[PDB]
Design a protein around this nucleic acid. Structure first.
Ligand SMILES: C=C[C@]1(C)C[C@@H](OC(=O)CSCCN(CC)CC)[C@]2(C)[C@H](C)CC[C@]3(CCC(=O)[C@H]32)[C@@H](C)[C@@H]1O
Ligand SMILES: [Cl-]
Ligand SMILES: [Cl-]
Ligand SMILES: [Cl-]
Ligand SMILES: [Cl-]
Ligand SMILES: [Cl-]
Ligand SMILES: [Cl-]
Ligand SMILES: [Cl-]
Ligand SMILES: [Mg+2]
Ligand SMILES: [Mg+2]
Ligand SMILES: [Mg+2]
Ligand SMILES: [Mg+2]
Ligand SMILES: [Mg+2]
Ligand SMILES: [Mg+2]
Ligand SMILES: [Mg+2]
Ligand SMILES: [Mg+2]
Ligand SMILES: [Mg+2]
Ligand SMILES: [Mg+2]
Ligand SMILES: [Mg+2]
Ligand SMILES: [Mg+2]
Ligand SMILES: [Mg+2]
Ligand SMILES: [Mg+2]
Ligand SMILES: [Mg+2]
Ligand SMILES: [Mg+2]
Ligand SMILES: [Mg+2]
Ligand SMILES: [Mg+2]
Ligand SMILES: [Mg+2]
Ligand code: NA
Ligand code: NA
Ligand code: NA
Ligand code: NA
Ligand code: NA
Ligand code: NA
Ligand code: NA
Ligand code: NA
Ligand code: NA
Ligand code: NA
Ligand code: NA
Ligand code: NA
Ligand code: NA
Ligand code: NA
Ligand code: NA
Ligand code: NA
Ligand code: NA
Ligand code: NA
Ligand code: NA
Ligand SMILES: [Sr+2]
Ligand SMILES: [Sr+2]
Ligand SMILES: [Sr+2]
Ligand SMILES: [Sr+2]
Ligand SMILES: [Sr+2]
Ligand SMILES: [Sr+2]
Ligand SMILES: [Sr+2]
Ligand SMILES: [Sr+2]
Ligand SMILES: [Sr+2]
Ligand SMILES: [Sr+2]
Ligand SMILES: [Sr+2]
Ligand SMILES: [Sr+2]
Ligand SMILES: [Sr+2]
Ligand SMILES: [Sr+2]
Ligand SMILES: [Sr+2]
Ligand SMILES: [Sr+2]
Ligand SMILES: [Sr+2]
Ligand SMILES: [Sr+2]
Ligand SMILES: [Sr+2]
Ligand SMILES: [Sr+2]
Ligand SMILES: [Sr+2]
Ligand SMILES: [Sr+2]
Lengths: 160, 337, 172, 142, 132
RNA sequence: CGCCACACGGGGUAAGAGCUGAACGCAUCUAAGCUCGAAACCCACUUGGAAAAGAGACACCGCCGAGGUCCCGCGUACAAG
RNA sequence: CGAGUGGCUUGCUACCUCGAUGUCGGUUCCCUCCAUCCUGCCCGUGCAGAAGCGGGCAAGGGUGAGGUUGUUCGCCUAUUAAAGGAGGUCGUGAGCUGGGUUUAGACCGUCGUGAGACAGGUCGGCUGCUAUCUACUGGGUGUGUAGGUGUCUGACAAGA
RNA sequence: CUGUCCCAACGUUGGGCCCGGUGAACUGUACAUUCCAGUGCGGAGUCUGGAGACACCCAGGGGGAAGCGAAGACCCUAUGGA
RNA sequence: AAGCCUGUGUACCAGGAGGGGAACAACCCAGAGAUAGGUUAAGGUCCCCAAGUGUGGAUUAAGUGUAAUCCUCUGAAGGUGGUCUCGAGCCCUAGACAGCCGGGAGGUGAGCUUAGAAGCAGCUACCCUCUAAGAAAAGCGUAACAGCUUACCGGCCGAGGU
């Protein structure tokens, strides 16, 4: 289904699983990528993907933008490179779809989404100085699979 | 899914109304090539007969063999170029300036025109030469006229007058060529302008058919099958859709058929002669006995037997000239068999 | 901005409106140089291209006008030379100059001759297998040289097998 | 042939609409205006887009009609009509006392009203009305 | 195709039962299509003398029947026009079967042929009995 | 259902192939400039077209007579006109 | 996975019309759209040629005949350069047809105690009106331009 | 077997068109020479903007007046009828 | 999703003129006895149309735009050496950036692998002479050599460059 139906934030906070039943599980597999044994402070660089517009991105759009994003870091830095990527958001917002007529309008449960406010970091990678232009490219591919226009911000890195 | 089909009838010869002048009026004239001369002649249609020829085309495998070709007999008696007209180049097109007239007129030319008694050709000619010197002189045309009294089969004695262009040489030498024909009496035959075997353009007003329906007029389908017995036979399906809530002028409707001016292109002149060689036994149907100056035009020609037709050297020919064909046999058999 | 161009001893350039005519021992090249707020002038013996504005779009043309003048100077002194060599594989191609147009016959086995036209004054002269396009107006020469190569354009088949045609060998 | 004009205007290198607007204003004041050298008039902008707009107006029409002039003669005369209430009493009399001419049928040179003139040395993107007319389908009679 | 050297008035239609003027075992032939012809809305595809037509065998021998073979229109009832102005018409409407290279499927062809079919399909002519 | 006739060529483009050419010393088909390039666009050609209110031009004839209408005999015309 | 255009399908809504805006399919006749099936000119190629494949420009013209079925759709045959798709009250019944849907008659199957029912099948089963206005096709009579005849021009208009 | 069709043609009689006489009706809120768009209760000759448009009359075939004709038989509703 | 269904607060339409918005119940000004003079509001001043072709300044080259709100006026994700303004680090008359020329050397074809590999198949190393430079060779190229360049030095040039 087109994300045009769920991208906007207009429905109330519908997250309480003790009231909602038959919720489809997360399509996302890994929230912590790279070398999760090493710290984020052991890295000189911290480049994040900032969302410009206040959206509601689905678990499918999250998995897809995480996949081709991490798959560039596995391609360019190897299967065990010197990096650690992270997706700090989690899909809590349960979605509906009415599928009769308008009689009994409350739709059945179809999927999950994450409420992302403007200015927030969806993804945050921590890499080395030489591997930086590979991550600014892992994020150029990642923003094409989510709904908004994005900023790639360097939070640690005067090495240019 | 509603099979395609081209619209019924042409939308170029519009509107299909009655013609103003029964005498054809050209709107296009040939390009200037060599020798200065008149760009057109005129005659009266006589009828049809077949003629046997020798194939002139070098591209055809029939080159040299006998071939039967249909021919329209048109009597073309000598015309009189009674005047010369000049056009000044105005920002509004080509507007007329002045006319140079004669002294010797035809005994029965006062049946249509107000024949001049006191005219000044000299100073009018001066105005044309001053306009030529100025550089604003456009194209020079001659006021031609026919001699219907020369044709015994045509009841009309009242001359058909029409304008004809002169071109070929430089603007100076053709103005003078024109003036030279005029000062004599203007007598000119078909031999003067046309040579046999050449391609000409015959313009004529068609046969008058009165008011005819869509089927005949625009060649639309008659109602087919079951739809033919319900009370509708020669009437069309509809005058148009719901919206546009108006009937378009493009829809095949009833009206006046015939008496339209047509300019039939690339007509080959098969023979130009004099006497009684193309005449038919018992005379031509609804016309009469041909004896005198004529032309033999290949195929058909617009209009009925007795109507005035006009000639012009082909503005758009496809094949290269094959002058003077070997005309072996011309038929004389009666058209009443 | 302003750029002052020194005109050589063999060269003489005259101005009439926005038109520049450059005369010399090889010929006369007339050109029309026009663009917003740019004015070209002759300060006795120097060509001055000056405009009050310094924006990139204007700087693009001031630069283009300089190379249009500098190259007109070479046109009237030494001249422009483009060298061409006719190439054929199976068919005996004939390239003959007829009037104010260069003609190519029997190209790839065709009955119909392929004819272009010589732009302006330009001299196209053949020495057997070679051809040398020459003249003062680089605009006419470069185009007459191009017109010749382009006249043998084949889009219908593979150009890697069908390599027949005149090509440009020497670029000035 | 003969027109007793109060004001005679020269359209040479003058921005069409701006001239038309001052000619329209004056027609309503009770002046007999005569626009001269219409072929030598001008319209600012990309040639390719100005032509598309004018070519479309020639394609537009039905059985009722929509006659749009091609000749630079009438193109000026119709733009003036678009600035005058030509369907009212007053507006018809004012429009009919304004005629546009190709070249100059008079001896007296026409004046160039203030603000209407274009600077060719400062501009390159414009078109001549006659250049539009040759592209529309007219015959160069000027 | 190559000119016939005569103007024809198409005497056949699609679905038209014509004769098979040969020894192939085919007696009656039924026209299906006219090679190279494209019509108009509401028109039965017309066939004439000297046209390569697609045909199906109506009457004949068990092995030859129900076959879709190509043929050339040899004879027709509707008058055709020779250059000398004379019209020519035949007794019946007949055709001879042909192959890929336009050679007759048989050996001996029955009845007269037209001299115009000779120019085009010469391999049928150099097998013809009578030529008119 | 028979027979006759129904372009070629130009002009400007599109996609496109290119030339001179700078911003950007080079390069670059493009930003200024230019040469080419579609059955497509304008012209050509055919038909209408003084009611085009800027309501047109020329030649002649006549303003006490030019010319037309009626009338009469009929069609190359025609439902009345 | 994301971003959209369209208004041809379907669905949703119930704004419009219940003192009636006649159905489907077909037909006839006219204008149009381009998201191009062919034709024109082009780009790439896993472009030798040949026949293709994929893309660009482009709506001038063309895009046909038939077998089953009421069919739209679709399957099928043979021809063709190709046998493109869509809009115009799902164009068009004061034009046609009336095969299908959807009256009153009757049969079968299913359900029903029964009358009777069926978004199951089937046979039979009607098509009103003299055009006022407007619209366009053609035909006249007046007025304007301001005496007569003949010849033209060309703003524009149509075409494939 | 054939004009049902390909594909339409000519002809015949009564009309149809003009003249004498006779002489109705359906329909009519008003205005009304329209067209292209737009707007409006979302389907305008009449609103907005343009375009076009000299008046009257003859014949026509019926695109439009959501044409004329019938207080929808469908559908729902009524504390309706049979 | 809706010119959707259903609440709530409020103002308005219904039952509200007049002015503006092209037309348009509800958007803006405005609530309005008659008549009259005057100044304003919303909105607007090139013409149609009352009032500026007003002033100082910059941008835009697409007719973008000339469309407050809207079913109604669209335009998105992505892309942009179109162009304008601004800041930041670094290089530069000890001559930068580019371009053109010149040089691009020997020990030495590194060694191993291998019949062979000699800058450039693969493994590992990746070392020092001459000099103003010159890699155990970065990119192409060869069956391999060869050839062409690339790092790197010099010259020409001359101003900002990245
Ligand atoms: C009968 C009304 C008919 C003639 C046809 C009608 O169709 C129907 O109403 C469905 S039932 C049709 C058959 N009808 C008898 C004719 C059953 C009573 C149909 C098509 C619609 C669906 C309803 C509206 C409509 C007018 C507009 C229209 O399309 C018509 C009515 C007002 C029309 O009078
Ligand atoms: Cl029918
Ligand atoms: Cl029109
Ligand atoms: Cl008005
Ligand atoms: Cl400019
Ligand atoms: Cl077929
Ligand atoms: Cl109040
Ligand atoms: Cl515009
Ligand atoms: Mg006879
Ligand atoms: Mg006989
Ligand atoms: Mg090929
Ligand atoms: Mg059919
Ligand atoms: Mg009711
Ligand atoms: Mg209706
Ligand atoms: Mg396209
Ligand atoms: Mg079209
Ligand atoms: Mg419909
Ligand atoms: Mg209807
Ligand atoms: Mg009906
Ligand atoms: Mg049935
Ligand atoms: Mg039935
Ligand atoms: Mg009726
Ligand atoms: Mg009921
Ligand atoms: Mg009851
Ligand atoms: Mg109320
Ligand atoms: Mg004012
Ligand atoms: Mg816009
Ligand atoms: Na239900
Ligand atoms: Na009837
Ligand atoms: Na209808
Ligand atoms: Na403008
Ligand atoms: Na028009
Ligand atoms: Na061309
Ligand atoms: Na949409
Ligand atoms: Na819908
Ligand atoms: Na129908
Ligand atoms: Na098309
Ligand atoms: Na079918
Ligand atoms: Na309908
Ligand atoms: Na129907
Ligand atoms: Na009916
Ligand atoms: Na009959
Ligand atoms: Na009607
Ligand atoms: Na109130
Ligand atoms: Na108002
Ligand atoms: Na605009
Ligand atoms: Sr909501
Ligand atoms: Sr996005
Ligand atoms: Sr249809
Ligand atoms: Sr004439
Ligand atoms: Sr004409
Ligand atoms: Sr009937
Ligand atoms: Sr309507
Ligand atoms: Sr003013
Ligand atoms: Sr180009
Ligand atoms: Sr007049
Ligand atoms: Sr398009
Ligand atoms: Sr094609
Ligand atoms: Sr349907
Ligand atoms: Sr089906
Ligand atoms: Sr029925
Ligand atoms: Sr029953
Ligand atoms: Sr049923
Ligand atoms: Sr009057
Ligand atoms: Sr009638
Ligand atoms: Sr101003
Ligand atoms: Sr609307
Ligand atoms: Sr954007």
């Amino acid at each position: 289904k087109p994300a045009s139906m769920y991208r906007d934030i207009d429905k109330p906070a519908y997250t309480r699983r003790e009231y909602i039943t038959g919720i489809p599980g997360s399509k996302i597999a890994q929230h912590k990528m790279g070398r999760k044994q090493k710290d984020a402070d052991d890295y000189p660089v911290q480049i994040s993907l900032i969302v410009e517009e206040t959206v509601q991105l689905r678990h499918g759009s999250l998995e897809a933008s995480r996949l081709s994003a991490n798959r560039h870091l596995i391609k360019e830095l190897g299967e065990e490179g010197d990096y650690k990527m992270t997706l700090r958001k989690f899909p809590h917002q349960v979605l509906r779809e009415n599928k009769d007529g308008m009689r009994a309008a409350f739709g059945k449960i179809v999927g999950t989404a994450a409420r992302v406010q403007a200015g927030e970091q969806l993804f945050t990678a921590y890499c080395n100085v030489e591997d930086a232009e590979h991550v600014k490219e892992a994020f150029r591919r990642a923003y094409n699979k989510i709904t908004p226009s994005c900023r790639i911000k360097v939070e640690r890195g005067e090495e240019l | 899914p509603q099979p395609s089909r081209p619209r019924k009838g042409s939308l170029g010869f519009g509107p299909r109304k009655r013609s103003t002048s029964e005498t054809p009026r050209f709107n296009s004239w040939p390009s200037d090539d060599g020798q200065p001369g008149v760009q057109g002649f005129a005659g009266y249609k006589a009828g049809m007969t077949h003629v046997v020829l020798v194939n002139d085309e070098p591209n055809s495998p029939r080159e040299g063999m006998e071939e039967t070709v249909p021919v329209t007999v048109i009597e073309t008696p000598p015309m009189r170029a009674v005047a010369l007209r000049a056009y000044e180049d105005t920002p509004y097109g080509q507007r007329p300036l002045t006319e140079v007239w004669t002294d010797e007129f035809h005994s029965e030319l006062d049946r249509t025109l107000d024949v001049p008694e006191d005219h000044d050709p000299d100073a009018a000619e001066e105005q044309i030469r001053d306009a030529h010197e100025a550089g604003d002189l456009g194209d020079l045309r001659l006021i031609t006229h026919t001699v219907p009294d020369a044709v015994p089969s045509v009841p009309k004695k009242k001359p058909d007058v029409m304008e004809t262009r002169v071109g070929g040489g430089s603007v100076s030498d053709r103005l003078d060529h024109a003036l030279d024909i005029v000062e004599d009496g203007g007598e000119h035959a078909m031999n003067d302008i046309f040579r046999a075997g050449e391609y000409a353009d015959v313009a004529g007003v068609t046969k008058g058919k009165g008011t005819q329906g869509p089927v005949k007029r625009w060649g639309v389908q008659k109602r087919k099958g079951k739809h033919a017995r319900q009370g509708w036979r020669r009437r069309i399906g509809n005058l148009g859709p719901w919206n546009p809530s108006r009937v378009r002028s493009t829809v095949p409707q009833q009206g006046q058929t015939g008496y339209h001016q047509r300019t039939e292109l690339n007509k080959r002149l098969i023979d130009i002669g004099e006497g009684d060689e193309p005449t038919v036994d018992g005379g031509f149907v609804n016309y009469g006995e041909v004896d005198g100056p004529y032309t033999l035009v290949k195929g058909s020609v617009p209009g009925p037997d007795k109507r005035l037709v006009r000639f012009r050297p082909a503005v758009r020919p496809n094949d290269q000239p094959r002058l003077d064909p070997e005309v072996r046999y011309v038929s004389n058999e009666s058209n009443q068999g | 901005p302003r750029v002052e161009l020194e005109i050589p001893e063999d060269v003489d350039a005259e101005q009439d409106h926005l038109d520049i005519t450059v005369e010399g021992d090889n010929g006369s090249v007339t050109r029309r140089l026009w663009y917003p707020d740019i004015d070209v002038s002759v300060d006795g013996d120097t060509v001055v291209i000056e405009s009050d504005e310094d924006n990139a779009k204007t700087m693009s043309t001031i630069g283009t006008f300089q190379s249009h003048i500098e190259n007109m100077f070479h046109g009237v002194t030494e001249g422009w030379e483009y060298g061409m060599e006719v190439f054929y594989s199976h068919f005996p191609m004939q390239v003959n100059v007829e009037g104010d147009e260069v003609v190519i016959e029997n190209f790839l086995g065709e009955k119909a001759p392929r004819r272009t036209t010589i732009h302006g004054d330009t001299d196209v002269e053949i020495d057997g297998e070679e051809l040398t396009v020459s003249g003062p107006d680089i605009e006419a020469v470069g185009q007459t040289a191009a017109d010749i190569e382009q006249l043998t354009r084949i889009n219908d088949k593979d150009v890697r097998v069908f390599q027949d045609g005149v090509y440009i060998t020497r670029k000035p | 042939a003969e027109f007793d004009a109060d004001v005679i205007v020269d359209a040479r290198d003058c921005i069409m609409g701006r001239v038309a607007s001052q000619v329209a204003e004056q027609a309503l004041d009770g002046e007999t205006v005569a626009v001269v050298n219409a072929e030598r008039a001008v319209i600012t902008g990309r040639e390719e887009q100005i032509v598309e707009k004018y070519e479309k107006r020639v394609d537009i029409g039905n059985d009722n009609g929509y006659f749009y002039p091609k000749r630079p003669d009438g193109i000026f005369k119709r733009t003036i009509r678009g600035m005058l209430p030509h369907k009212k009493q007053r507006g018809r009399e004012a429009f009919e006392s304004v005629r546009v001419y190709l070249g100059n049928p008079y001896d007296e040179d026409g004046e160039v009203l203030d603000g209407t003139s274009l600077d060719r040395l400062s501009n390159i993107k414009f078109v001549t009305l006659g250049e539009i007319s040759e592209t529309l389908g007219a015959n160069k009679t000027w | 195709m190559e000119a016939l050297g005569a103007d024809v008035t198409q005497g056949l239609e699609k679905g038209s039962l014509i004769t098979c003027a040969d020894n192939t075992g085919a007696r009656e032939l039924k026209v299906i299509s006219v090679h190279g012809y494209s019509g108009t809305k509401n028109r039965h595809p017309k066939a004439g003398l000297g046209d390569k037509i697609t045909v199906s065998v109506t009457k004949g021998t068990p092995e030859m029947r129900r076959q879709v073979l190509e043929a050339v229109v040899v004879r027709q009832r509707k008058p055709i026009r020779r250059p000398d102005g004379t019209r020519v018409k035949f007794e019946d409407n007949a055709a001879v079967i042909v192959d890929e290279n336009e050679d007759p499927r048989g050996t001996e062809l029955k009845g007269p042929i037209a001299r115009e079919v000779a120019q085009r399909f010469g391999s049928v002519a150099s097998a013809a009995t009578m030529i008119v």
